Design an enzyme around this catalytic site. Structure first.
Site, short mmCIF file in Angstrom:
data_model
loop_
_atom_site.label_atom_id
_atom_site.label_comp_id
_atom_site.label_asym_id
_atom_site.label_seq_id
_atom_site.Cartn_x
_atom_site.Cartn_y
_atom_site.Cartn_z
N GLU A 137 0.87 -1.20 0.00
CA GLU A 137 0.00 0.00 0.00
C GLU A 137 0.89 1.23 0.00
O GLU A 137 0.68 2.18 -0.78
CB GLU A 137 -0.94 0.05 1.21
CG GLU A 137 -2.08 -0.91 1.09
CD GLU A 137 -3.03 -0.86 2.26
OE1 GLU A 137 -2.75 -0.19 3.29
OE2 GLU A 137 -4.07 -1.56 2.19
N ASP B 153 -8.47 1.21 8.47
CA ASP B 153 -8.80 1.10 7.03
C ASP B 153 -9.86 2.12 6.70
O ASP B 153 -9.75 2.81 5.66
CB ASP B 153 -9.33 -0.29 6.67
CG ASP B 153 -8.31 -1.39 6.54
OD1 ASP B 153 -7.42 -1.47 7.44
OD2 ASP B 153 -8.42 -2.23 5.65
O1 LIG Z 1 -3.88 -15.22 3.59
C1 LIG Z 1 -4.65 -14.02 3.77
C2 LIG Z 1 -3.69 -12.94 4.27
O2 LIG Z 1 -2.78 -12.68 3.20
C3 LIG Z 1 -4.51 -11.70 4.56
O3 LIG Z 1 -3.60 -10.74 5.07
C4 LIG Z 1 -4.10 -9.37 5.05
C5 LIG Z 1 -3.50 -8.73 3.81
O4 LIG Z 1 -3.91 -7.35 3.77
C6 LIG Z 1 -3.44 -6.69 4.93
O5 LIG Z 1 -3.79 -5.30 4.80
C7 LIG Z 1 -4.09 -7.21 6.17
O6 LIG Z 1 -3.62 -6.48 7.31
C8 LIG Z 1 -3.70 -8.67 6.30
O7 LIG Z 1 -4.38 -9.23 7.42
O8 LIG Z 1 -5.47 -11.99 5.54
C9 LIG Z 1 -6.43 -12.87 5.08
C10 LIG Z 1 -5.75 -14.20 4.81
O9 LIG Z 1 -6.75 -15.11 4.21
#
Ligand SMILES: O[C@@H]1[C@@H](O)[C@H](O[C@@H]2CO[C@@H](O)[C@H](O)[C@H]2O)OC[C@H]1O
Length: 392
Positions: free
Chosen positions: A69, A277
Site C-alpha cells: 500500500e 482502514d
Molecule cells: O492469507 C490471507 C492474508 O494474506 C490476509 O492478510 C491481510 C492482507 O492485507 C493486509 O492489509 C491485512 O492487514 C492482512 O491481514 O489476511 C487474510 C488471509 O486469508
C-alpha cells in the site's frame, strides 16, 4: 466534475490560503517524508540500484516493513507531484522485489503486501488496494511523462497487471507460509475488489478498497475487453458506499461483505468497526464525486460524516462503532487528513473547519508517521487541487 472541466477545486484557496503558502505546505510535507531525518521524519529510503537504475521504498517505520500500500501511495504522490525520479525508484523496488512473476505461485501477478527491507516476504499474498493504486499511478505516469521501455513502459505494465487482476485463475502452490490457494482480485459477478484473493477468505471486500474514481480511469484506458467490467465496478462501488456507510454517521467498517454488511474477520473480529482502514472511505467517495460527479449520494454522506465528527470536537477518538460510539485512541493526523478530504463533496460549510484543521497540522514524526504521513500528503494534494486524473 473536475475531469470534464479540467478545474480541480483548491479547497485551501477557498478557505483563504495563498498559492505561495499552499506550495510551501506541500513541499514541506514532501521534503520531510521523502528526505527528512531517517529515524524521526522520513518514510522513504534510497536502496541502491540495479539494471533499471535507482531503487527506493516507502516503508512502515514502526514494524520496519515495506508495505505494498505505502509503495503504491508513494507512486501516486510522486506522479501527482511530478517527481519522476522518485516514482521510478519506488516502482523499480516494487516490481523487482514485491511482484510475484511465477505462474505456479498462488500470488502470481500480485505484490506481497508485507516485505522486509531485504526483500524477504512476510506474506506473498497482496493487499488489493495496493494493486489498485499501482495500476492507476502507472496510467498517470504514462500520461504525465510518456512511456519508457521495459518496466518504465508504464502503460503496458498497467494494462498487463490490471488484466491479470481481473482474469487470474485459481492457483494452488507453495508459498513462504506453506501451500496456499488464491484467485482473482475482483469478484467476477459482484464486480467488487476482494479483501484477499486467498480462497480461505476471498468472498469479502473492504469499503476503503473501493475506488470508483480510479475505475473510471480504467473504463477509459484499460484493455478494451475489460472496460465494461471496470465501468460496472465504478457504479457498484457507489451503490456499495450507500449500503456500507451507517445511515446516520456515514462511518464504514474496516471489512465488509459484498452485500454491504460488515464482516468480522475470524483473526480480527473488531473489523466490523470504523478503524484504520475505514478512515479512507470518505476520501474514496469524495474524490470520485469531485472528479466525475456521478455518486449522487456522496455529498450527503460527506456531510453526515463531518456532522458526526463535529460532535467529537475536543474528545476525538480514532476508533468508532458505526453508530458513533467512541472505542478508543485519540486524534490522529491520518484521520484529520481523511476527514478534510470529505470537503471534495460536502455541501455544509462546516467543511471549512475540517480543511482548516488539516492546514494547521505539521508533518508527522516518530513511530506512527508512515500511515499518518502517506494519508497527510495525499490529503494535502487533494485539498490543494493538485491531485488530478492524468489520463493517457
Ligand atoms: O492469507 C490471507 C492474508 O494474506 C490476509 O492478510 C491481510 C492482507 O492485507 C493486509 O492489509 C491485512 O492487514 C492482512 O491481514 O489476511 C487474510 C488471509 O486469508
Amino acid at each position: 466534475g473536475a475531469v470534464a472541466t479540467g478545474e480541480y477545486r483548491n479547497l485551501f484557496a477557498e478557505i483563504g490560503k495563498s498559492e505561495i503558502d499552499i506550495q510551501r505546505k506541500i513541499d514541506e510535507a514532501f521534503q520531510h517524508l521523502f528526505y527528512g531525518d531517517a529515524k524521526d521524519a522520513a518514510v522513504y529510503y534510497q536502496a541502491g540500484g540495479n539494471e533499471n537504475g535507482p531503487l527506493a521504498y516507502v516503508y512502515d517505520v514502526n514494524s520496519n516493513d515495506v508495505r505494498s500500500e505505502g509503495m503504491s501511495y508513494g507512486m501516486m504522490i510522486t506522479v501527482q507531484m511530478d517527481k519522476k525520479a522518485e516514482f521510478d525508484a519506488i516502482w523499480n523496488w516494487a516490481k523487482t522485489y514485491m511482484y510475484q512473476d511465477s505462474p505456479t505461485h498462488p500470488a502470481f501477478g500480485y505484490f506481497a503486501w508485507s516485505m522486509r527491507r531485504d526483500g524477504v516476504a512476510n506474506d506473498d499474498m497482496p493487499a488489493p488496494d495496493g494493486e489498485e493504486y499501482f495500476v492507476t499511478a502507472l496510467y498517470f505516469a504514462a500520461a504525465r511523462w510518456g512511456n519508457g521501455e521495459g518496466i518504465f513502459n508504464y502503460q503496458q505494465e498497467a494494462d498487463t497487471i490490471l488484466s491479470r487482476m481481473r482474469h487470474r485463475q485459481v492457483i494452488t502452490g507453495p508459498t513462504n507460509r506453506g501451500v496456499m490457494t488464491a484467485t482473482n482480485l475482483f469478484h467476477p459477478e459482484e464486480a467488487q475488489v476482494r479483501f484477499t484473493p486467498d480462497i480461505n477468505n476471498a468472498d469479502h471486500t473492504d469499503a476503503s478498497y473501493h475506488l470508483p474514481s480510479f475505475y473510471e480511469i480504467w473504463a477509459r484506458v484499460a484493455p478494451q475487453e475489460d472496460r465494461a467490467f471496470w465501468a460496472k465496478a465504478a457504479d457498484v462501488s457507489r451503490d456499495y458506499f450507500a449500503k456500507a456507510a451507517h445511515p446516520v454517521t456515514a462511518l464504514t467498517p474496516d471489512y465488509g461483505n459484498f452485500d454491504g454488511t460488515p464482516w468480522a474477520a475470524s483473526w480480527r473480529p473488531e473489523s466490523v468497526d470504523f478503524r484504520y482502514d475505514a478512515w479512507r472511505s470518505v476520501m474514496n467517495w469524495s474524490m470520485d464525486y469531485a472528479w466525475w460527479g456521478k455518486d449522487s449520494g456522496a455529498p450527503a454522506r460527506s456531510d453526515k460524516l463531518l456532522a458526526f465528527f463535529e460532535t467529537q470536537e475536543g474528545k476525538m477518538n480514532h476508533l468508532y462503532s458505526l453508530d458513533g460510539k467512541p472505542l478508543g485512541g485519540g486524534p490522529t493526523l491520518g484521520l484529520i487528513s481523511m476527514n478534510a478530504t470529505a470537503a471534495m463533496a460536502a455541501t455544509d460549510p462546516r467543511w471549512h473547519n475540517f480543511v482548516e484543521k488539516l492546514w494547521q497540522q505539521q508533518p508527522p514524526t516518530g513511530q506512527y508517521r508512515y500511515y499518518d504521513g502517506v494519508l497527510y500528503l495525499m490529503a494535502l494534494l487533494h485539498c490543494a487541487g493538485e491531485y488530478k486524473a492524468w489520463i493517457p
